[PDB]
Amino acid sequence: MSIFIGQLIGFAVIAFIIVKWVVPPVRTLMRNQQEAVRAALAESAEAAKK
């Protein structure tokens, strides 16, 4: 099962790289879209009140 250990270490490296580099930008994109839709909802409510 030595190859199993090697491929597990490879997957650990891949996951570390993902969490370090890729996850933050995609999280930022999701947050930006969520904030945009929330702001659109708030602005629509404000416009109706106005």
Binding site: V37, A40, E43, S44, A47, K50
Partner: protein, 57 residues
């Protein structure tokens, strides 16, 4: 589709609020001017009638 409709209707409603307030003061000024003109007509006709009465007398 619902979100796009919400955005378009919100923009249209902001424009409509602006246009409605604008028409609000427009009609307010128009009717105030109408009332002032009617008051001026009242005064002018009263003055003319008094002038005719005094001239005849």
């Amino acid at each position: 589709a619902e979100r796009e409709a919400m955005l378009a209707k919100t923009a249209a409603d902001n424009r409509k609020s602006a246009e409605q307030v604008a028409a609000a003061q427009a009609d307010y000024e128009k009717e105030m001017a109408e009332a002032r003109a009617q008051a001026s007509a009242l005064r002018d006709e009263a003055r003319a009638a008094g002038r005719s009465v005094v001239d005849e007398k």
